[PDB]
CSV table of N, CA and C and ligand atoms in Angstrom, one decimal:
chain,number,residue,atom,x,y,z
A,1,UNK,N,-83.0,105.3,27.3
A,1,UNK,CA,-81.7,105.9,27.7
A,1,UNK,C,-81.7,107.3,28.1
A,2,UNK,N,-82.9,107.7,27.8
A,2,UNK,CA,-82.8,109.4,28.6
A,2,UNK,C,-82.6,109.3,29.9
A,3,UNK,N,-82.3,110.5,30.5
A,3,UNK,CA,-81.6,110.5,32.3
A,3,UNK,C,-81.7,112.1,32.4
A,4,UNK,N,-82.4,112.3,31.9
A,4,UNK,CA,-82.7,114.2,32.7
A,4,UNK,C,-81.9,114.9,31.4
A,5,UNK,N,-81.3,114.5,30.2
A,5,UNK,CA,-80.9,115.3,29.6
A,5,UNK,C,-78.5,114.7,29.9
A,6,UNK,N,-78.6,113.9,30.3
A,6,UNK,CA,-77.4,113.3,30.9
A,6,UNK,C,-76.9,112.3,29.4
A,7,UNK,N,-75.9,112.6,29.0
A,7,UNK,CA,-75.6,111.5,28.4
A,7,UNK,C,-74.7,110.3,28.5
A,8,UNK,N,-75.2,109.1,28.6
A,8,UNK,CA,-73.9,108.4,29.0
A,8,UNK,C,-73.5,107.2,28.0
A,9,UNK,N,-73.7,107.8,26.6
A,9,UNK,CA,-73.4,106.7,25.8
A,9,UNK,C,-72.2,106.4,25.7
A,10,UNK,N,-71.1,107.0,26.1
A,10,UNK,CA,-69.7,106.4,25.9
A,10,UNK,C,-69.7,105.8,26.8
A,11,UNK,N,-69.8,105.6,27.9
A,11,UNK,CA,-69.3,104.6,29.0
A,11,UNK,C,-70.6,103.7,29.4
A,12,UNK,N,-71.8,103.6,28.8
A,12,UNK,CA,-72.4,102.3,28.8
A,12,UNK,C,-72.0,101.7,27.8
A,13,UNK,N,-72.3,100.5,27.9
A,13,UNK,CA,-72.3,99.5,26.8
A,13,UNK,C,-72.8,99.5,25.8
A,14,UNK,N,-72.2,99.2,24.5
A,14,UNK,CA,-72.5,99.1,22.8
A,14,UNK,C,-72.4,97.9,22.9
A,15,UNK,N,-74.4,97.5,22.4
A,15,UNK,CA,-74.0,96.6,21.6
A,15,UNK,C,-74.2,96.1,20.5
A,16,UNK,N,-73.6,97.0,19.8
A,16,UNK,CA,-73.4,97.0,18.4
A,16,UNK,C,-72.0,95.9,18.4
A,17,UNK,N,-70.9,96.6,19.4
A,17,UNK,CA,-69.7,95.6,19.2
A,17,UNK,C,-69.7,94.2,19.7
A,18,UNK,N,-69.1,93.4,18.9
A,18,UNK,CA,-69.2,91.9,19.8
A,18,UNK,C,-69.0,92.1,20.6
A,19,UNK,N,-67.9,92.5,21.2
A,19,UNK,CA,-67.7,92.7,22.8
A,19,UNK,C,-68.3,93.5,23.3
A,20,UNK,N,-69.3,93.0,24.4
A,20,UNK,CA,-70.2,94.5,25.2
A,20,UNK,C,-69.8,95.1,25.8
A,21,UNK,N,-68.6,96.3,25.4
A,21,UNK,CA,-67.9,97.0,26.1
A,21,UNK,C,-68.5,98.7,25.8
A,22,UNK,N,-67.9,99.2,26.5
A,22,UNK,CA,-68.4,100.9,26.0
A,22,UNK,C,-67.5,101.3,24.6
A,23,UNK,N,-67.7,102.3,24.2
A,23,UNK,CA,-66.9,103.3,22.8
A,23,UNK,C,-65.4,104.0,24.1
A,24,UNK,N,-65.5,104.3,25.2
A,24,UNK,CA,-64.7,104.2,26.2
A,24,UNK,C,-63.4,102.9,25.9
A,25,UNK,N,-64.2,101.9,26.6
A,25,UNK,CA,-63.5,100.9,26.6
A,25,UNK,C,-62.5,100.3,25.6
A,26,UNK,N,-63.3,100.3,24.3
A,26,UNK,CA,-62.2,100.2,23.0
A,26,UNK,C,-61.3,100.7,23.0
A,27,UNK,N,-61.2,101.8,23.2
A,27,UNK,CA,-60.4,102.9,22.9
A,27,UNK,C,-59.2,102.2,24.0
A,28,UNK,N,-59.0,102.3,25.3
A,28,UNK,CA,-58.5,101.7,26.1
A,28,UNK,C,-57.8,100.4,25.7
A,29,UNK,N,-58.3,99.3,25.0
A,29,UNK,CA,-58.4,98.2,24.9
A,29,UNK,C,-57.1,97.9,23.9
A,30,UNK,N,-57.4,99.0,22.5
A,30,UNK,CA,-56.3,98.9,21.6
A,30,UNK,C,-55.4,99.6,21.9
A,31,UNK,N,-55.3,100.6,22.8
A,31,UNK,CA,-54.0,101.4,22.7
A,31,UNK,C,-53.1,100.6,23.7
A,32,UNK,N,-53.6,99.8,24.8
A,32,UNK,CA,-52.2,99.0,25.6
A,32,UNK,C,-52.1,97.9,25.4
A,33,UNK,N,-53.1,97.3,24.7
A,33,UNK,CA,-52.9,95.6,24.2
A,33,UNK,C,-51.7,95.5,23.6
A,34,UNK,N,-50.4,96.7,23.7
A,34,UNK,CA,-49.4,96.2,21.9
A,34,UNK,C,-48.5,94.9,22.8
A,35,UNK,N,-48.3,94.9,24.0
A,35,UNK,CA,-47.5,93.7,24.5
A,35,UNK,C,-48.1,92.6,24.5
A,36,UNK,N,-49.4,92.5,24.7
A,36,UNK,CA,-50.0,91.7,25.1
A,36,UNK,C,-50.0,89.9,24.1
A,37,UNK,N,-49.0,90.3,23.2
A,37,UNK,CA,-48.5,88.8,22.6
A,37,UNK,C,-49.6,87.6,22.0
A,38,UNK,N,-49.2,87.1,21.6
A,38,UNK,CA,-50.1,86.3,20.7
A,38,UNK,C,-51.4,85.4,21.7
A,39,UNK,N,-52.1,85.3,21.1
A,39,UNK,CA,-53.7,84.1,22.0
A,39,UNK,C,-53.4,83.3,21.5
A,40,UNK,N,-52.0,82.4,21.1
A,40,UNK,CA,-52.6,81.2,20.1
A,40,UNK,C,-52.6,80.2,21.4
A,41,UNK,N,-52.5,80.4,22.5
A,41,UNK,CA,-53.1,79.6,23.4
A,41,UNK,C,-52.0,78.9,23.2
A,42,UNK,N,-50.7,78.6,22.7
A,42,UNK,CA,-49.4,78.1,23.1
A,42,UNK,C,-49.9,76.2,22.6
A,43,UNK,N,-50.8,76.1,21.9
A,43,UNK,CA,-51.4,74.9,21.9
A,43,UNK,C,-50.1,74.5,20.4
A,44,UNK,N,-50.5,73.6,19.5
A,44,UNK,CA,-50.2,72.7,18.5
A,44,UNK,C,-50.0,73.9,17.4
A,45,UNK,N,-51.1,75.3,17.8
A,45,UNK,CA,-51.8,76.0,16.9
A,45,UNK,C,-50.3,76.5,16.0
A,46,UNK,N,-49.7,77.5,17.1
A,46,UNK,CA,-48.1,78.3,16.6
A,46,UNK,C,-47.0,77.1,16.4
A,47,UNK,N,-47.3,76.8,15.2
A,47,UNK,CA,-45.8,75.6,14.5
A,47,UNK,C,-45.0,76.7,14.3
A,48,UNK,N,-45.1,77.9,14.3
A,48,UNK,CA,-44.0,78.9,13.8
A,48,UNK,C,-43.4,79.5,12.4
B,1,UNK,N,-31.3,66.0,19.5
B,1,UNK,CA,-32.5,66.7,20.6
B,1,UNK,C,-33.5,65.5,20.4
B,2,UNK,N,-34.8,65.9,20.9
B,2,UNK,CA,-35.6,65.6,21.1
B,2,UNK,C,-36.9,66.4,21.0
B,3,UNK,N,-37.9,66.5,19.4
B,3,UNK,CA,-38.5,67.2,19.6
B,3,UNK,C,-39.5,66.8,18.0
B,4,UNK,N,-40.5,67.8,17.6
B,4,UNK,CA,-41.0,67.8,16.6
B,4,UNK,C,-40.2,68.7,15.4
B,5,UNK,N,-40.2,67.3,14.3
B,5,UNK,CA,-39.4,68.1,13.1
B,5,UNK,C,-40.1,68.7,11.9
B,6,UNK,N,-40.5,69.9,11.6
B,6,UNK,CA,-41.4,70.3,10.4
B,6,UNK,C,-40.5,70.8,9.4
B,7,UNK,N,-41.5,70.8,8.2
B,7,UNK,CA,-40.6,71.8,7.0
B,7,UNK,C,-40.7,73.1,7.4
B,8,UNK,N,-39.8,74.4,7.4
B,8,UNK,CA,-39.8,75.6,8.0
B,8,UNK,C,-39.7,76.6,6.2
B,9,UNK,N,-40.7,77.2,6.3
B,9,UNK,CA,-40.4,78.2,5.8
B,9,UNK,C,-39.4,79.0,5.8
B,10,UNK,N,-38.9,79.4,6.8
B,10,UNK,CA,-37.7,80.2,6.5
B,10,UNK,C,-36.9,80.5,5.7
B,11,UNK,N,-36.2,81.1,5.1
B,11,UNK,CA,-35.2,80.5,3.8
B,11,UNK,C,-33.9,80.6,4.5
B,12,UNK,N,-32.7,79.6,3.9
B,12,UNK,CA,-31.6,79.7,4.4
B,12,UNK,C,-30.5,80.4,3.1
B,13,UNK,N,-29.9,80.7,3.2
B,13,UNK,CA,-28.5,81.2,2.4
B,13,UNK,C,-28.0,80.0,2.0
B,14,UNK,N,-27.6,80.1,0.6
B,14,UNK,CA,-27.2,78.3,-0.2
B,14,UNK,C,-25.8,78.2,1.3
B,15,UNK,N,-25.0,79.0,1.6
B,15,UNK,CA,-24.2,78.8,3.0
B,15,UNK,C,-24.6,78.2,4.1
B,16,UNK,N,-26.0,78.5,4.3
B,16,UNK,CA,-26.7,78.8,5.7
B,16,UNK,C,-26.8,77.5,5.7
B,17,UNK,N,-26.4,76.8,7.4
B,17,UNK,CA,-26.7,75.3,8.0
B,17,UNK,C,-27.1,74.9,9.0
B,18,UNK,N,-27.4,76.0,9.2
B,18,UNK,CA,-28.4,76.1,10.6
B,18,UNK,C,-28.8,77.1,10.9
B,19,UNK,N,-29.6,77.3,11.9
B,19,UNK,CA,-30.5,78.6,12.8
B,19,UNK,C,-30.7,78.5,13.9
B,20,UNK,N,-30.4,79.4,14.9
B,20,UNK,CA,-30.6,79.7,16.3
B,20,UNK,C,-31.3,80.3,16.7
B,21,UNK,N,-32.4,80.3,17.8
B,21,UNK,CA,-32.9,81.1,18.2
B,21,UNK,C,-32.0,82.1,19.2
B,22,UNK,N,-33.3,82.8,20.3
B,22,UNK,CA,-32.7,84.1,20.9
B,22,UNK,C,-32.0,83.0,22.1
B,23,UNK,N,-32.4,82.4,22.4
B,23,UNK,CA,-31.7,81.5,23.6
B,23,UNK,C,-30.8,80.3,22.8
B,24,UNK,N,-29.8,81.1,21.9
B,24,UNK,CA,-29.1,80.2,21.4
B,24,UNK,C,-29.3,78.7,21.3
B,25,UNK,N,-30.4,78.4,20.8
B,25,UNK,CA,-30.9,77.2,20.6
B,25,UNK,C,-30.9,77.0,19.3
B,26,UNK,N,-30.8,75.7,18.8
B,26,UNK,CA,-31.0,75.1,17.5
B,26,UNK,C,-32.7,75.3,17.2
B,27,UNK,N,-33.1,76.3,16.4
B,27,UNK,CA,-34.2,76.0,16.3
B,27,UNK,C,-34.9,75.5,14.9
B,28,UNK,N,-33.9,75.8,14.0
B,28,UNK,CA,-34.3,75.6,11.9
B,28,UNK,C,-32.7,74.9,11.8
B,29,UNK,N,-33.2,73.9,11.1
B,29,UNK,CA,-31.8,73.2,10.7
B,29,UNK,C,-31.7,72.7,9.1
B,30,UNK,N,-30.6,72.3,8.6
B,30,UNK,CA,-30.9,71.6,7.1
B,30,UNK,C,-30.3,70.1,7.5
B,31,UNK,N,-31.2,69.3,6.6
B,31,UNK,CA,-30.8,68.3,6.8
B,31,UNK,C,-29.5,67.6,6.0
B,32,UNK,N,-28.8,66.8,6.5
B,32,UNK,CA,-27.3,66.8,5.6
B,32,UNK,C,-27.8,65.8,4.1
B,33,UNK,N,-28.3,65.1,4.2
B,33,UNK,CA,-28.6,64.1,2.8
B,33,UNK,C,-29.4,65.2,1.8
B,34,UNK,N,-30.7,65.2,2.5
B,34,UNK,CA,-31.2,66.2,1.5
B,34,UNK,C,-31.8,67.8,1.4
B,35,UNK,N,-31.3,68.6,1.3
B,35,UNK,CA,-31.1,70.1,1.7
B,35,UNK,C,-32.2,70.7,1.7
B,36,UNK,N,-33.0,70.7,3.2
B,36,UNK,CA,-34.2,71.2,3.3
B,36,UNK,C,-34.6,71.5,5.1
B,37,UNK,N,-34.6,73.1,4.9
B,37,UNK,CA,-34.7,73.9,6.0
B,37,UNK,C,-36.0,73.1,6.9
B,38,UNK,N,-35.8,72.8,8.1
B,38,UNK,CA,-36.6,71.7,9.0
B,38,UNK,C,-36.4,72.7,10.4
B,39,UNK,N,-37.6,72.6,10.7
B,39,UNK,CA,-37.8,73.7,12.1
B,39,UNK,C,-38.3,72.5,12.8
B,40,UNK,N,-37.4,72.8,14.1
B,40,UNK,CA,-37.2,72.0,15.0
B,40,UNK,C,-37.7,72.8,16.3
B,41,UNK,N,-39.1,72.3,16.7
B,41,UNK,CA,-39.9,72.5,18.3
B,41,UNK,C,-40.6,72.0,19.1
B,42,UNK,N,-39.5,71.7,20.2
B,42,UNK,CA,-39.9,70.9,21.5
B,42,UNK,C,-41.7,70.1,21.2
B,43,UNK,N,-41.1,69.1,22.0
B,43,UNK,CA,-42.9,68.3,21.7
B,43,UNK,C,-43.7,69.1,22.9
B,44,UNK,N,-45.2,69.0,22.8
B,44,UNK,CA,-46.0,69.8,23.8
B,44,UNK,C,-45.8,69.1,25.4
B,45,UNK,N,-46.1,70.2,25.7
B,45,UNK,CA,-45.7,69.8,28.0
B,45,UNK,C,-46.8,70.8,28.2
B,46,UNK,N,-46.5,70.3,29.6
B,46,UNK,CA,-48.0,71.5,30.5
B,46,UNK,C,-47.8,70.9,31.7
B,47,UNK,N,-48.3,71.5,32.6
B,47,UNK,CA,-48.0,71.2,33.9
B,47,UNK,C,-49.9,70.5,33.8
B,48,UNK,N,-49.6,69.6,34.9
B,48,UNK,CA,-51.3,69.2,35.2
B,48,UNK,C,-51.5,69.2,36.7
B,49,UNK,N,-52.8,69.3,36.7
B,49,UNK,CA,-53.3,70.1,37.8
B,49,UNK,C,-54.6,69.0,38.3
B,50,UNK,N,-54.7,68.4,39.6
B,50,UNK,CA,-56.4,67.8,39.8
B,50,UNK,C,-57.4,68.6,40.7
C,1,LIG,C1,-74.9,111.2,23.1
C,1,LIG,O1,-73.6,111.2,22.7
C,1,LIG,C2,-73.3,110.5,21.5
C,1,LIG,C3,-71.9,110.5,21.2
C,1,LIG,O2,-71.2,111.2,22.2
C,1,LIG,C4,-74.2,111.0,20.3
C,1,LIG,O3,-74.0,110.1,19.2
C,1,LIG,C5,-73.8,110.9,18.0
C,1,LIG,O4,-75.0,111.0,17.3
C,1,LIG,C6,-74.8,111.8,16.0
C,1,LIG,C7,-76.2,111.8,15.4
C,1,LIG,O5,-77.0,110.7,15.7
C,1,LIG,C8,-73.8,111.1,15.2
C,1,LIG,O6,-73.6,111.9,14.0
C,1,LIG,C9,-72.5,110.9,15.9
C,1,LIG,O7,-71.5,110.2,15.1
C,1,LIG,C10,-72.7,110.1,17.2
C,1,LIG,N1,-71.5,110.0,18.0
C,1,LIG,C11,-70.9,108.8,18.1
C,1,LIG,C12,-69.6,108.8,18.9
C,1,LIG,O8,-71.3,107.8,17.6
C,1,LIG,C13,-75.7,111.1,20.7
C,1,LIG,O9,-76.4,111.7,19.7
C,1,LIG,C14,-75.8,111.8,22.0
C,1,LIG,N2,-77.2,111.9,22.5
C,1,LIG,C15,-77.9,110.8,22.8
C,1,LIG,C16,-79.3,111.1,23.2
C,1,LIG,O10,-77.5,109.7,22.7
C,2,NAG,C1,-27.1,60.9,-0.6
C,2,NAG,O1,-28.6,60.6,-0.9
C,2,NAG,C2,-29.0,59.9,-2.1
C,2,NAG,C3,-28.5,58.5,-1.8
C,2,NAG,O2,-27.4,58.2,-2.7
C,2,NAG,C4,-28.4,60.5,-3.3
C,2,NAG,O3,-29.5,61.0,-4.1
C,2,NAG,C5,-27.5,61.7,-3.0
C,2,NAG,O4,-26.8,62.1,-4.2
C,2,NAG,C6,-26.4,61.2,-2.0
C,2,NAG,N1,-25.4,62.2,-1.8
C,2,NAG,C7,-25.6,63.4,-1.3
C,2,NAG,C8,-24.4,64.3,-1.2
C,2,NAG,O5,-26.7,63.8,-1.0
C-alpha cells in the first residue's frame, strides 16, 4: 500500500469489515440509512 | 375481513375492543367469547413476474 508517501487508507477498502467498504464509506452509510426502514423483506418474517 | 389471525402482543385497556391502524384499519381486535387481543394481517400477495 505505499504510493510515494500518499495515503489512501480511508477511501480504499477495509477488509477487516464484512462489508468491503472503506472507513469513508461507513461513516456515510450510518448517518442516512435512518429512513431507510426495515429489510425484513416484507416476507411471513414481520407478524408485527 | 379476510386475513391471518395471530395472538398480538399488544396490551389492550380492560375497556379497549379494538385497534386501528394509521389507515384506519382494523388491525388488533378482541375476540367477543374469549378476551384475547388477536392481530389481524392481510394474507401474503406479490405481484408475479415471467
Ligand atoms: C494512514 O492513515 C491511517 C488513518 O488515517 C493511519 O492509521 C492509523 O494508525 C495508527 C497507528 O497504527 C493508529 O493509532 C490509528 O488509530 C490509525 N487510524 C485509523 C483511522 O485506524 C495509518 O497509520 C496511516 N499510514 C499508513 C501507512 O497507513
Ligand atoms: C361463552 O363461552 C363459554 C361457553 O359457555 C363460557 O366459558 C363463557 O362463560 C360464555 N360466556 C361468555 C360471556 O364468554
Amino acid at each position: 500500500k505505499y504510493f510515494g508517501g500518499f495515503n489512501f487508507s480511508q477511501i480504499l477498502p477495509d477488509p477487516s469489515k464484512p462489508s468491503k467498504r472503506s472507513p469513508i464509506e461507513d461513516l456515510l452509510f450510518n448517518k442516512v440509512t435512518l429512513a431507510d426502514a426495515g429489510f425484513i423483506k416484507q416476507y411471513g418474517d414481520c407478524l408485527g | 375481513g379476510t386475513g391471518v389471525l395471530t395472538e398480538s402482543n399488544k396490551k389492550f385497556l380492560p375497556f379497549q375492543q379494538f385497534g386501528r391502524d394509521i389507515a384506519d384499519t382494523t388491525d388488533a381486535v378482541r375476540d367477543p367469547q374469549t378476551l384475547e387481543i388477536l392481530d389481524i394481517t392481510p394474507c401474503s400477495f406479490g405481484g408475479v413476474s415471467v
